[PDB]
């Protein structure tokens with residue numbers, strides 16, 4: 001009779017359509033609680049994310065709304081696509097929660113980073129991240145907050161980016177991961193498309209090192225890790241900084257920066273075959289072009305895709321895919337509800 005049923009998953013109640021059976025928790029990426037389920041209508045496994053009262057504050061509201069809208073502005077195999085969107089509540093007055101449904105993936109990228117991967121798997125994951133970012137850029141979306149916890153993969157090495165990045169205070173206990181953010185985001189500079197290349201560089205570097213490249217309590221410690229490893233940026237970079245941040249940056253101790261063979265030694269890559277010796281030099285060369293502080297000198301998405309380490313996967317069909325304010329709680333609730341009801 002009723003088209004919904006309720007189940008307790010962890011500490012959260014999931015009220016879902018009856019088509020979704022055998023709900024099991026599969027973690028929390030960023031914006032909510034996520035379950036694996038069997039979809040009896042599509043005869044396939046799915047992942048279901050619950051957004052609880054997303055209109056409760058500005059931060060949750062802005063993100064929930066912009067991601068509901070942006071899903072319809074994208075259509076690419078390396079970017080999240082929803083199978084379903086629903087609410088069990090019947091009216092705007094009763095409206096509480098949003099449920100998002102997508103295909104069930106096999107792991108988060110954080111899990112994948114911890115494994116020893118061959119060059120074929122690493123270059124294919126990076127290639128897909130680049131195809132996904134190029135698709136976003138072509139749709140007018142510059143991410144600025146790409147990180148492994150928002151990236152999922154299947155056993156066949158297939159990859160999807162789950163979020164749309166940056167558009168502020170959280171009263172909840174969950175903290176933000178800033179380690180993959182570009183110097184332009186760290187230093188409040190103004191940016192272009194290749195702001196996302198830095199994040200790809202941070203991910204690739206961590207795949208090789210098995211340690212976060214630029215950790216820190218906040219941007220102070222993080223900036224120190226950047227300059228310790230890559231060296232103090234050029235005076236040409238300094239000129240593009242706002243006066244106060246420029247004074248801060250110019251007054252930090254000056255660092256020469258370590259070379260890329262020192263940063264990513266031969267021991268981190270397989271040295272068995274001539275094939276792997278060459279792939280190691282190409283991987284390090286790509287790292288040296290992505291992990292560059294000054295965006296005027298960092299490689300573009302299009303040049304990264306033409307790089308010999310990545311280009312082996314290049315497919316025009318996968319790269320040339322045709323691309324199609326402040327509010328109160330009350331206002332955000334209706335904006336979100338309207339997107340949910342379409």
Ligand SMILES: O=C(Nc1cnn(-c2cccc(C(=O)Nc3cnn([C@H]4CCNC4)c3)c2)c1)Nc1ccccc1Cl
Pocket residue numbers: 026027029034036045047048049080100101102103104105106107108152162163
């Ligand atoms: O985080 C997500 N989506 C998402 C997808 N898949 N995964 C994921 C991540 C980590 C692990 C797993 C995992 O455990 N998958 C697993 C379990 N079982 N199976 C096989 C094996 C046997 N038959 C089923 C496979 C899934 C996470 N957010 C999201 C969800 C729905 C809509 C919108 C959003 Cl942003």
